[PDB]
């Protein structure tokens, strides 16, 4: 089939629309997610026009291999979409009404800075390539863009499925292309972190600090060193889903902070003993008494330093 | 082919039916499972009608590309169903009897609150989209809905495969749609938990409490700290199949409880030593003697507090 | 095409046959395995009959879409079989000789009781559905049922590929169905367990018992507690392929047994110290001397109690 | 299409050829690997013959569904090969020149005895099934068998892609079959093992032996027991890709050996203490002094015992 | 269809072009990555030529099965490319303009020497096979080779998508083949390594060295041995994506170095005690005092020895 000819010199307006049936499987690592949805496209292919008087029909149905349809595709997809044609109904004037049930893995990037409170905007990029005879421009039919009430993305809170109304029109490989931006807004469900990560990962750090209430280097080595294992152990129980960072995570900084508060504790206890062994248990007692407040205070302040910086 | 015309103004009644051949692979994480089953649909497509006198035949067989069949689909499926047409037999009046052997990964959500005693209702959503000329409504042919005696879901106990008789009829993208709810009821096989999780994960917590029967801070640090590793170690051997929770698990609360009974034990032993070092081994002896009953009693009561709350 | 008409009122006999080309990938967890094999079916479709005198041919070859073939399927398969038609040759009388190279993931359940010495019978269920005009019954052509000499299932010992000669004939969804049972017998290759699981997992349990040859509570806490970590650590190195058990494994009981022999050892050492601290190092010395024999003897006997019960 | 008729009574000679484009993904566990290659087959199908004088053409090209091609398949493949037809060119006499770009996962078994120095011969089994009218025998066209210079199997060293010239001709399911053996020879790249497995896994075993340079049972329990954890810990960092063994690995024996040298060390230290506690620090001092040489010597000799046995 | 005949004796020039739509999933292990891109090919197939005067058309569109297209393929691909034809437009002279949207997993090897600062050149090998009548040579249409501004490879920094202008022309299996080299240049995003690997993996190594500030063999065994576990533990938290090395990694050397600085520390502490036990606490005090500087200095120098060697 041939592309529709111009009424005057204008490009073809293809009125897009995506309705999310089911949205799932967000791999924080790969920065992907799978989407199951309806794609409704509208265009005036004048050629198709039929009179209601002569044709006994109302709105004639058509097959995809039976009529011309523009090459509508996605940009940030793994493999091409799992398209399944629903209906192609042509209005008496020649206005086609395309519908399909696509199922493809999207590839939208994520922000792991603000994590575990991280908030995201996922992208779906609709593209259509212009031909040798006429050109194509995309439009957002505001009425066939949305999300079902049944859509669940366990771990995230689906806020609003929107669309960037203005299209991008550009040249590439000697052809005009129309690029649309579909934006999905999500926020994180961080409820479990506090009681099952931050609160237990804190307790471990405090069992470490019971070394300043001791005099015994033999009990403090077993305190500070053991809790370090306890940390890495729990740090392993909590192995999440977080890729390679050329930047810093809000957690990334906190983790680097703990790996110091254990090491610093090791210095303190190594000195607490060496000062006492050299027979000056006056500093060696002022130093232990100091870190009783120094560590907790420095820590609480260091958390505010991070929080104020990141957020 | 064209949809059947109305005898008067009524929509087409498609009499559904699902018989579970094989049910397997329940991923607690993704909240999915794979199903292998038979789909039997019945409708009066008057057009097909043939006389028994003129036609030498009884009940004529037909091909899927040879006759009109309504677009029957599933809502909560990963990728579209692996449909394999069995038989399409038309009764003399024009009553079609469709049958297929679909094989698709369902996406039904789960309740991890009551876990490891968690009980579930899984969902299969049958949908059919209405056309430009007539509309479609779904019905439950109570006689072709069930499960085979051979169906196994190791880890769960398959109770009853049912169907929500009343259909949902609603508008979406300017089209009428009929939505049916197929419900599968399952309960958990928690037998191994008690002797291979709760009972060993308890023993570790008790080897911790043998610190109140000691006077030695050097043996109690090695008791309480070591068992914490022993816990996280076993807690790692027991790494299950449990996604992200914006709520609380019955186990989730218990785990948070243990991470306290170890930390609290650390406080006790840090004080038991500090009281004795400051030369008051009267409290330091009343405090150790107290926790001999305090910890076990507080613990047993704390378990009842949880159990009564969750269940 | 139409099903063959009856010579008198009899159902069609389809003479089955499965020859295992390659058998592999047994997932103990999912209770599955993949099979690559040949399916040879024989039936007298009288219609096809051709005279050797008039037809210049001997045994005419035919295409699958060129002739009627009964809907032969498998019951316990993940997704439908990866069928690849080999040859369809019709004998002068009309006796068809079907052959294909199917490749599908089977779903046969397993017995993890007797494990690591567990022995299995895997199932392949061949089904054929009867039509509106005649019915179908299955037969075992004893000559085209077997296994190649090259078949390997590393970890198991392929004993005998058999077939349940008698077919199951039953009603379901108003249709007669013929169900055949293909049984594959396998046994376990447990050679590595003894020297790389039971023997090292024993040694750890004995380094624990060197606590009765000590007087020092500080060395016994470090003995008994450390070895518990050593156990869970090795118990983690040995993380196998074993699903959810609503019953008990032979290993399951042994594991529960070890988690006691460590806990019991903890009681002993907690008492050994508390008796000595209360100044009665007469029992505290009789109790330590007792467990020198009590633990080993109780243990060896407890293993016989299990072995005699399970086997 | 029909198989070519005999010039006299001979079977058809199909001249095979495999050229490895890309070879990758060797799963030591499943004993598989994926191969991307070219399959060139040559046969004299007399029927196709065309005169150079009458036909304006030279060597006529043909489609796969346009001409007869023998059912060429693989035996040890997961699912059937991902065949992609390249060219089918027929020489004036009727000599067909088939070519395709197959991509399938092979299933060749491995030897884990000599590991990490293990050497392998992988198998590709080409099969062709004979028909009702003529029979088929396979030949190795020595000129279209090889491997590209770009082929990489990181972890192995690709030595030589060969072919077993002599074919296997046998009866199965009343049909003649021709079986060819394609052999790929590979050897292991064990460079990292010595400095990042054997050398660190040795150091751990030596930190254990610093127990004979001590008198203190409290420091030796903490030495020998701790290093056992250190071992299992590192033994876990080194968790490779090695299936179930009904035999013994060269490493399998070494591992069983270390799990003794730790246990034996536990006996020594338990006696070193018990002899000294019973007041005979003359043996208890001869025994400690003995194991200073006994363990290292016994060990070095035990390694030679293994190496000489395995290799 | 037939290949275009020569204007004189020249081979056909196919003007290639690859524009990277989306580039993702780089598996350091398998040495692969997935690419989604546009392939534009240009050739003068004189046969297609049509006059602008007689033909009412301008630049006639054509189907792939409607015209001859050369067998353009990739060499280092897993399975054949997921090709999706965009447009085939023929200019009045007969100059075809092919375009497709391929999606295949590439197989380019990597350098893990300079890692985590490793820099790579990935390969895409375009091949075209010559026929019985004319031959084919490849060309780089410099104008349709590039990468989009949206291309992201999280963990790497996409530098420049280039092409080796000069083609490789060689004989293989009696056929001429044209091989092109597409090179993608990437560099690593090593920001997180320093604060979340090297800095914490250093701290652990320093808590070890607080053994020279002690006199107590019982506290030094618990220091040096415990930190070794802490190391292997963290070394496990940091389990990356790094295959089998027949060479040495920059990290590979550093890791081997740490496994010595712990072992050497074990020797020191075993001697520190044995010298003191033999009553010579003059060396035993000079040796401990020495390693206070010896270890740090030797270490810092050993890092420069590596860095200068690798880089």
Curated annotation (Swiss-Prot), chains A, B, C, D, E:
Effect after changing residue 218 to A: Decreases cation selectivity. Decreases the binding affinity of TEA and TBA. Nearly abolishes block by Cd(2+)
Task: Name the source's superkingdom.
Answer: Bacteria
Keyword Ribonucleoprotein annotated: no
List all topological domains (Cytoplasmic).
Answer: 213-215, 278-280
Where's it mainly located? Answer: membrane
List residues traversing the bilayer. 190-212, 216-240, 249-277, 281-311
Q: Which residues lie on this side of the membrane: Periplasmic?
A: 1-189, 241-248
Q: Which Gene3D superfamilies match?
A: Neurotransmitter-gated ion-channel ligand-binding domain (2.70.170.10), Neurotransmitter-gated ion-channel transmembrane domain (1.20.58.390)
GO cellular component terms listed in the entry, alphabetical order: plasma membrane
Q: What else is known?
A: The homologous nature of GLIC to eukaryotic nicotinic acetylcholine receptors and other eukaryotic pentameric ligand-gated ion channels, and its sensitivity to general anesthetics, define GLIC as a structural and functional model of signal transduction in the nervous system, also relevant for exploring the molecular basis of anesthetic action.
Sorted alphabetically, which PANTHER family does this protein's record hold?
NEUROTRANSMITTER GATED ION CHANNEL
Function noted in UniProt: Cationic channel with similar permeabilities for Na(+) and K(+), that is activated by an increase of the proton concentration on the extracellular side. Displays no permeability for chloride ions. Shows slow kinetics of activation, no desensitization and a single channel conductance of 8 pS. Might contribute to adaptation to external pH change.
Q: How does it assemble?
A: Homopentamer.
Q: What does the domain comment read?
A: Consists of an N-terminal ligand-binding domain that encloses a wide aqueous vestibule and a transmembrane domain that forms a narrow channel.
Question: Under what name is this protein listed?
Answer: Proton-gated ion channel
């Amino acid at each position: 089939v041939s592309p529709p000819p111009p009424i005057a010199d204008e490009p073809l307006t293809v009125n897009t629309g995506i309705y999310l049936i089911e949205c799932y499987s967000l791999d924080d690592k790969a920065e992907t997610f799978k989407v199951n949805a309806f794609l409704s496209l509208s265009w005036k292919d004048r050629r198709l026009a039929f009179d209601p008087v002569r044709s006994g029909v109302r709105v004639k149905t058509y097959e995809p291999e039976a009529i011309w349809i523009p090459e509508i595709r996605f940009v940030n997809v793994e493999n091409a979409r799992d398209a399944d044609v629903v209906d192609i109904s042509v209005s008496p004037d020649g206005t086609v009404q395309y519908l399909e049930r696509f199922s493809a893995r999207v590839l939208s990037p994520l922000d792991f800075r603000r994590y575990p409170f991280d908030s995201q905007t996922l992208h779906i990029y609709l593209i259509v390539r212009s031909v040798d005879t006429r050109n194509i421009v995309l439009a957002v039919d505001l009425e066939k863009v949305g999300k079902n009430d049944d859509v669940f993305l366990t771990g995230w809170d689906i806020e609003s499925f929107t669309a960037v109304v203005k299209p991008a029109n550009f040249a590439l490989e000697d052809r005009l292309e129309s690029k649309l931006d579909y934006q999905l807004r999500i926020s994180r469900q961080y409820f479990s972190y506090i009681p099952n990560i931050i609160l237990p990962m804190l307790f471990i750090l405090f069992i470490s600090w019971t070394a300043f209430w001791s005099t015994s280097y033999e009990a403090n080595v077993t305190l500070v060193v053991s809790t370090l294992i306890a940390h890495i152990a729990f740090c392993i129980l909590v192995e999440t889903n977080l890729p390679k960072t050329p930047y810093m995570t809000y957690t990334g900084a906190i983790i680097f902070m703990i790996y110091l508060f254990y090491f610093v504790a090791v210095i303190e206890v190594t000195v607490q003993h060496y000062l006492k062994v050299e027979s000056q248990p006056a500093r060696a007692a002022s130093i232990t008494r100091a870190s009783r407040i120094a560590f907790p205070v420095v820590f609480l302040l260091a958390n505010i330093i991070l929080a104020f910086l990141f957020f």
